[PDB]
Design an enzyme around this catalytic site. Structure first.
Site: not given
Ligand SMILES: Nc1nc2c(c(=O)[nH]1)N[C@H]1C(S)=C(S)[C@@H](COP(=O)(O)O)O[C@H]1N2
Ligand SMILES: O=C(O)c1ccccc1O
Ligand code: MOS
Ligand SMILES: Cc1cc2nc3c(=O)[nH]c(=O)nc-3n(C[C@H](O)[C@H](O)[C@H](O)COP(=O)(O)OP(=O)(O)OC[C@H]3O[C@@H](n4cnc5c(N)ncnc54)[C@H](O)[C@@H]3O)c2cc1C
Ligand SMILES: Nc1nc2c(c(=O)[nH]1)N[C@H]1C(S)=C(S)[C@@H](COP(=O)(O)O)O[C@H]1N2
Ligand code: MOS
Ligand code: FES
Ligand code: FES
Ligand code: FES
Ligand code: FES
Lengths: 305, 745, 164, 102, 51, 50, 164
Positions: B232, B310, B691
């Site tokens: 990110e 968070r 998440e």
């Molecule tokens: N297969 C896979 N799933 C995953 C990830 C990934 O890198 N690979 N990233 C995770 C994280 S940390 C986040 S914030 C969300 C990403 O996006 P989405 O917003 O589309 O659900 O997916 C989750 N699921």
């Molecule tokens: O609130 C979050 O989960 C967050 C995640 C990535 C970057 C900024 C953010 O506020």
């Molecule tokens: O770690 Mo998921 O806010 S990219």
């Protein structure tokens, strides 16, 4: 199958097609490095920034790849792939009497939660032995059982049982600068002889602080009196060690509640670890050494009864 | 309409065949060069000098890049508090000092290896403890406080307190960081292919270091072999370095980190240190809580702040607490900067919360499920930050999970085993969770899309979100396919790029399907409007027909789409105003069987019930639940990072850092999506799922603790309401050392 | 005066006249042969992202044996006369997927998909040594394969159809 | 900074130069802040061939309209802060989640 | 269109990018596809970038 | 406002220096191949063979 | 046992150990040296898009003479010990434009710009042989240079500042 030679930027490589050629090359170039699976060297070069301009690969040499079934145990060429050793031992275990396959069982135990299929199919047996890692899971089992190492070097030839003297110091072994391990013979189990092997369910350092062991006991015929006792550990020092002092104090002794506590006291002292031991996990490593034997103990009472 | 159907990931076939192209799979240009970052070997020192005499001798050497080669600014970072290249001092071991460019990856590695740097060590802060002792933090303390402590801390029968710590975690995305930079040779233009969830910040950072307008940098993201948050922001560490090399040499340049470089430099999850205090009745009811959070931030700010926020927004989990107070402090240390990681602070907070909760039900000699359920929120309640909890489904998940898991009958079976076995014990624990959905930073809750319908009727969709394996593109294709009311086969998404959808937020915080889904929906509508007049004229005509007609009658078949998440804006002053758009709920039950002699254990069974509303794709959503849960189980019981006292990481690979393997998952692994629980707040009544499920992995951690306790009562003392501390991760070491007996003494 | 290195990849003969001892099979595959199907995930042998199948005649058991291996640690110089099989060597979408590739794809066993080629190759190898394996053998085939996305469940469930 | 894209192509007639000139006027900002990189089918679809001498007429109009749409969006921020720079209003429109793409 | 039609794939798969031309004067309004399609085929058939 | 002013072609400087990139000036990939069209040598005929 | 071909390009020494007689300077410049400033416009010597300046010491007039040439027809094998100067060798926008490049740019003498590098080099050469030439000499400098966009007027008008 003729000898091949490859020349690169910094290194030269030779594919020996014969044991004669190998003994010559090793003699002509002691310093040279043998390579079978490279699952150790490849790591040294990549992560340890090690340069060995001279490399010899024996994987082609009959012998170093031969598997014999003798009246003492089964012999494997040192270049044999662990998956081979695993296979040949699974058959033995399935066909032979349980009393004969004790040590074999222990070796198959170490090969379980071991790498993966990819590594075991190219990692050679000799490779693991000579690398002499402090946390090798096999040497503690090869030593505990006094496994037979048929060593060689153009002209000379000798066979000896592995022991605490085979690993002089860290990464070093009892091999001549021009000597090469030709084959290993894993010992058939004798009556009144029981074996066990355990290993820490984790690893946090490159090659230290991971308790792994091989234990063997031989009782007097028809009795519960100890004739021989071997407790070799790994992950407790810069090399594979044996609690020789402790297992001595138990010869001709009776396998019971007393002996258990006496061997424990013996380990906690003999294999003691300072507060600044390289690898940390002091509290845990002492406990495993004692705890693994405890299981050996319990398992033996079963096998005895 | 495929919405609500288990359509497999659109690229799964090509990923299985190896045809799917990842960043480093792109062919190299005949003149493409390679870069290798030169890193610090000290945690805190002074760069007395840098000698490349030897490096310059390595065949294929091209040049060494320093802070002096930078044409624009050497100031970077989410809060301009970092260096593209270290200049006078290094503030952590893996600090980037420079980079070597060579004709082959090998030559760049050998050469980079021989770069002699001279240091002069300086006082180094490495632990959270080290930081406090030196009053070394970033910014000021954060805190949410509702009600009043004393009045509850007095009213409370029992009062427990203590210190807790949760270790960090490496993302371990199978594909490490990687960037390809192509200098176009005109007006400073540069095209880059990068494995990142943040094309925008990558674009900005490269332009700022080059000192050129943002409109010159084009960042393209096809896909990522995993990101989990580690891409990110930290991905720009490599990007900028490679962009510089492209600029300086005028040659296309690339770099993909080895696993050991990756874990050392890119940072990971924030390790938390906590000091709590809970006030409760003997009924197991909480009436007063206090927690002081402390995270190890690293040598830069990055997202640490928002992460602590968070955490604070989650120190309550699913329990209503009358009088509560929690603070947070980011610790400045000479370690690589930690960043985002699936959970973004929530996991750490939810863990601490579950720790004092487990201790509550214990010190009260009451059943665990009894207590948690007593303290659980009710429909319409408000959190410690005052947001109304509408559509609270935890109870449905909890009751159902207990049912389908046969929790009560199994709880009995467990106790029996613990009586018939002396050196082996089993544990059982069911845990709930709620995760706030939305960026805590108001302005990131925006998404745009771009859609083209070509004259053959085929559609090309583009949106600000990126694909990292979660199946975002698959979902958008599903959405678009429904909205436009045409087969998925006619719609296609190629990649994510800054010249198609600008100023996009990083694909994160699990809201991608919510926002881009909406953004794509709107654009579809705009298209439908335009085509409407032609659908009427010719009702029996095919989609193709109407499209050609709209083109022939000169109607634009290209449009944008946009979405801003409605009603958001919490305030740390006034502790009021929505922080999230809604919440995602789940409940997991896990049984284990430890080995009191070795510290090892088995994950016998696990039952999960997640509330993902009306799923756009149930196959994708169950996969997210499972994979999130496994990373959780990893974080809490297997993954352990270890550094030398000098702040130098030792666990730099799969050999010394163990993420979950095939045989790590529970023998019985069942996942169920709550039925009939639509979410009006999101596209087609779906719910973020990325998440939220990760914390449920903790259900394994606490079952393990359950067993350890039965092992204590066994060979140890006889304290029923005793409370022993068990930090995270609960490794074989911590478990065994907790199983006190005639050997550990 | 250097010996040529000769071996095979996906059924095509490869003659390397200047083999460099330090060259890993992985690098050779990706860079010289342009077969990016095989991936680099760690370089130390523990993740399997770089898995391939090696076949070599044995002057003994007669038969040509088949086993999997980590190309990130396999020196090309040890492959003289050894046949290599990569993911692109057993099927594709421009032609036809091998049952193993079609299975894992449709069972949702692939997410980000970086670990897929290697797992596909581990399985392909198993089936090559045993047409109808046990669920236990199937699971053991992936001792050295890591996936961070799936949770593993889907993968195992999809390959169950090959057991019994 | 602004990136402009349109269905016309450059063959030496100076089409891009003209569009930059148009955009620069319509948005009322220096040409230096505006830039055109190339012509592509994924940015502007179903475009007519750059021909019949009408490129400056049509794409000019097309770029003018898009500029207007942008100006509309930025209007509320220009009012709040009259002495503010173009940059200021753009950041404000972004921070207040206003699409800056059209 | 022409490249997609010869390949037999939806138009949304082909991305055509034009930076500039060292002159066109009309001779590149259509006849340019004579070469384009031929090179696209070679790219497809060989899986190699072609020019 | 530069409309109505003789602003020189935005790329004239780079075309004078040879920095302006035309299609064939783009670098070739390590594996990029080359094509040569095979043309007829008759105005109207039958392709008996090739 | 082959002689090395040694020559210079933009002040940098170039050693070609395996020179191929059929290799034109144009191809060598664009492909081996990656200097795409020089263009291919006809391959037969009449357009000048491939113009460069060649310099070579003469065992006679002493002085090193300077003349322009069509790289599309110049065999690299005839350039041993000859110094080459391309458009990128006299100035750029990442540094500073040679007066000739700045002049033609600001005088609107460049449209599609494909013929520009060559005309710039023809002029550069003239000025190298004669600092202050006549309008006649300036015009004769472009006998072998073709432009399809400008009409030529602007180009000549921009280089008039160098006359008298
Ligand atoms: N297969 C896979 N799933 C995953 C990830 C990934 O890198 N690979 N990233 C995770 C994280 S940390 C986040 S914030 C969300 C990403 O996006 P989405 O917003 O589309 O659900 O997916 C989750 N699921
Ligand atoms: O609130 C979050 O989960 C967050 C995640 C990535 C970057 C900024 C953010 O506020
Ligand atoms: O770690 Mo998921 O806010 S990219
Ligand atoms: C992912 C992974 C997981 C692993 N897990 C385990 C584990 O759990 N427990 C354990 O014990 N080991 C483990 N290993 C270590 C592995 O077993 C050794 O790396 C391997 O067997 C070395 O053999 P090789 O054929 O690959 O040897 P090579 O890399 O060739 O290395 C061999 C070393 O031994 C010397 N040598 C080789 N053959 C001979 C011979 N015939 N005579 C004399 N000297 C010789 C070489 O010169 C060199 O010093 C693991 C390795 C990897 C990559
Ligand atoms: N320098 C230059 N000018 C040129 C051309 C060209 O190829 N190069 N094409 C011509 C032709 S044939 C047409 S139709 C118009 C092109 O576009 P315009 O519509 O923008 O004016 O430019 C004219 N002027
Ligand atoms: O010939 Mo101009 O209609 S392209
Ligand atoms: S790259 Fe991980 S095992 Fe080969
Ligand atoms: S699908 Fe990403 S690691 Fe397996
Ligand atoms: S290309 Fe026309 S004269 Fe050389
Ligand atoms: S500017 Fe086009 S030929 Fe001269």
């Amino acid at each position: 199958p003729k000898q091949l030679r490859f020349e690169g930027e910094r290194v030269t490589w030779i594919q020996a097609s014969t044991l004669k050629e190998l003994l010559d090359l090793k003699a002509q170039h002691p310093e040279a490095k043998l390579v079978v699976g490279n699952t150790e060297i490849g790591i040294e070069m990549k992560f340890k920034n090690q340069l060995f301009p001279m490399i010899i690969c024996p994987a082609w040499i009959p012998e170093l790849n031969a598997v014999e079934h003798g009246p003492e145990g089964i012999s494997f060429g040192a270049a044999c792939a662990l998956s081979s050793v695993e296979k040949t031992l699974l058959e033995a275990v399935a066909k032979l009497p349980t009393q004969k396959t004790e040590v074999f069982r222990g070796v198959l135990e170490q090969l379980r939660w071991f790498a993966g299929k990819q590594v075991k199919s190219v990692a050679s047996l000799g490779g693991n032995i000579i690398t002499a890692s402090p946390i090798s899971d096999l040497n503690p089992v090869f030593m505990a059982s006094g496994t037979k190492l048929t060593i060689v070097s153009r002209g000379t030839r000798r066979t000896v049982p592995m022991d605490h003297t085979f690993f002089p110091s860290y990464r070093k072994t009892l091999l001549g600068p021009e000597e090469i391990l030709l084959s290993i013979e894993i010992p058939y189990s004798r009556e009144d002889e029981f074996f066990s092997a355990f290993k820490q369910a984790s690893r946090r350092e490159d090659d230290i602080a991971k308790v792994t062991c091989g234990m063997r006991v031989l009782f007097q015929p028809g009795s519960m009196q100890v004739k021989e006792l071997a407790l070799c550990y790994g992950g407790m020092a810069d090399r594979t060690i044996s609690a020789l002092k402790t297992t001595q104090k138990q010869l001709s002794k009776f396998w019971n509640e007393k002996l258990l506590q006496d061997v424990c006291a013996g380990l906690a002292e003999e294999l003691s670890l300072s507060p600044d031991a390289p690898g940390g996990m002091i509290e845990f490593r002492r406990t495993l050494t004692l705890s693994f034997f405890f299981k050996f103990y319990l398992t033996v009472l079963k096998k005895l009864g | 309409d495929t919405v609500g159907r288990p359509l497999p990931h659109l690229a799964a076939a090509m990923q299985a065949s190896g045809e799917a192209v990842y960043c480093d799979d792109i062919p190299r240009y005949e003149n493409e060069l390679f870069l290798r970052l030169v890193t610090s070997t000290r945690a805190h020192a002074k760069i007395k000098s840098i000698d490349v005499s030897e490096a310059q001798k390595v065949p294929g050497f091209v040049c060494f890049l320093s802070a002096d080669d930078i044409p624009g600014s050497n100031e970077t970072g989410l809060f301009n508090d970092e260096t593209v290249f270290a200049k006078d001092t290094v503030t952590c071991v893996g600090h980037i000092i420079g980079a070597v460019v060579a004709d082959t990856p090998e030559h760049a590695e050998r050469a980079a290896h021989v770069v002699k740097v001279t240091y002069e060590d300086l006082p180094a802060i490495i632990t959270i403890e080290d930081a406090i002792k030196n009053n070394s933090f970033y910014g000021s303390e954060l805190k949410i406080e509702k009600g009043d402590l004393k009045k509850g801390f007095s009213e409370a029968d029992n009062v427990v307190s203590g210190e807790l710590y949760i270790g960090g975690q490496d993302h371990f995305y199978l594909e490490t960081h990687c960037t390809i930079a192509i200098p176009k040779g005109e007006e400073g233009e540069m095209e880059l292919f990068v494995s990142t969830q943040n094309a925008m910040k990558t674009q900005s950072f490269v332009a700022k270091m080059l000192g050129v307008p943002v409109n010159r940098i084009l960042v393209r993201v096809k896909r990522m072999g995993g990101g989990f948050g580690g891409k990110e922001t930290r991905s720009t560490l490599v990007s900028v370095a490679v962009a510089l090399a492209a600029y300086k040499t005028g040659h296309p340049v690339r770099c993909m980190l080895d696993r050991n470089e990756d874990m050392l430099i890119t940072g990971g999850r924030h390790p938390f240190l906590a000091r709590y205090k809970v006030g409760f009745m003997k009924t197991g009811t909480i009436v007063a809580l206090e927690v002081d959070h402390y995270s190890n931030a690293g040598n830069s700010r990055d997202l640490s702040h928002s992460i602590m926020e968070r955490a604070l927004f989650h120190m309550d989990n699913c329990y209503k607490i009358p009088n509560i107070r929690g603070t947070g402090r980011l610790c400045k240390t000479n370690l690589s900067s930690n960043t985002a990681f699936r959970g973004f602070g929530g996991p750490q907070a939810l863990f601490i919360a579950e720790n004092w909760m487990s201790e509550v039900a214990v010190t009260c000699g009451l059943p665990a499920e009894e207590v948690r359920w007593k303290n659980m929120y009710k429909e319409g309640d408000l959190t410690h930050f005052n947001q109304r909890l509408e559509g609270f489904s935890v109870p449905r998940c909890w009751d159902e999970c207990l049912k389908s898991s046969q929790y009560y009958a199994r709880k009995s079976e467990v106790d029996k085993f613990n009586k018939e076995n002396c050196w082996k014990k089993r544990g059982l624990c069911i845990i709930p969770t709620k995760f706030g959905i939305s960026f805590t930073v108001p302005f990131l809750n925006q998404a745009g899309a771009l859609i083209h319908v070509y004259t053959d009727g085929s559609v090309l969709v583009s949106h600000g979100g990126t694909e990292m394996g979660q199946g975002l593109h698959t979902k958008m294709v599903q959405v678009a396919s429904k909205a436009l009311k045409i087969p998925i086969s006619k719609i296609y998404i190629s990649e994510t790029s800054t010249n198609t959808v600008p100023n996009s937020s990083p694909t994160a915080a699990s809201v991608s399907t919510d926002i881009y889904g909406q953004a794509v929906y709107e654009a579809c509508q705009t298209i439908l409007k335009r085509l409407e007049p032609f659908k009427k004229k010719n009702p029996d005509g095919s989609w193709e027909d109407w499209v050609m007609a709209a083109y022939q009658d000169r109607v634009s078949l290209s449009t944008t789409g946009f979405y801003r998440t409605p009603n958001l804006g919490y305030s740390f002053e006034t502790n009021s105003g929505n922080a999230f758009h809604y919440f995602t709920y789940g409940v997991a039950c896990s049984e284990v069987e430890i080995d009191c002699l070795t510290g090892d254990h088995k994950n016998l069974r696990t039952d999960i019930v997640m509330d993902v509303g009306s799923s756009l794709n149930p196959a994708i959503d169950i996969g997210q639940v499972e994979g999130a849960f496994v990373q959780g189980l990893g974080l809490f019981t297997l993954e352990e990072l270890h550094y030398s006292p000098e702040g130098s990481l030792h666990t730099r690979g799969p050999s010394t850092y163990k993420i979950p393997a095939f045989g790590s998952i529970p023998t019985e692994f069942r996942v169920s999506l709550l039925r009939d629980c639509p979410n009006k707040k999101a596209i087609y009544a779906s719910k973020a799922v990325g998440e939220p499920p990760l914390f449920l992995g903790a259900s394994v951690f606490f079952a393990i603790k359950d067993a350890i306790r039965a092992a204590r009562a066994q060979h140890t003392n006889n304290n029923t309401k005793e409370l022993f501390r068990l930090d995270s991760p609960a490794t074989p070491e911590k478990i065994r050392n907790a199983c006190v007996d005639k050997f550990t003494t | 005066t250097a010996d040529e290195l000769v071996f095979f990849v996906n059924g095509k003969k490869v003659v390397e006249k200047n083999a460099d001892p330090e060259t890993t099979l992985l690098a050779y595959l990706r860079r010289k042969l342009g077969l990016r199907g095989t991936k680099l995930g760690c370089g130390e042998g523990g993740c399997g992202a770089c898995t391939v199948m090696l076949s070599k005649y044995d002057r003994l058991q007669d038969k040509i044996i088949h086993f999997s291996a980590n190309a990130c640690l396999a020196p090309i110089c040890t492959l003289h006369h050894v046949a290599v099989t990569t993911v692109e060597g057993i099927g594709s979408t421009k032609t036809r997927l091998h049952p193993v590739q079609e299975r894992i794809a449709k069972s949702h066993g692939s997410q980000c998909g970086f670990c897929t080629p290697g797992i596909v190759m581990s399985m392909y190898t198993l089936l090559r040594n045993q047409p109808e394996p046990t669920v236990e053998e199937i699971e053991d085939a992936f001792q050295g394969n890591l996936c961070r996305c799936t949770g593993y469940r889907p993968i195992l469930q999809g390959f169950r159809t090959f057991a019994k």
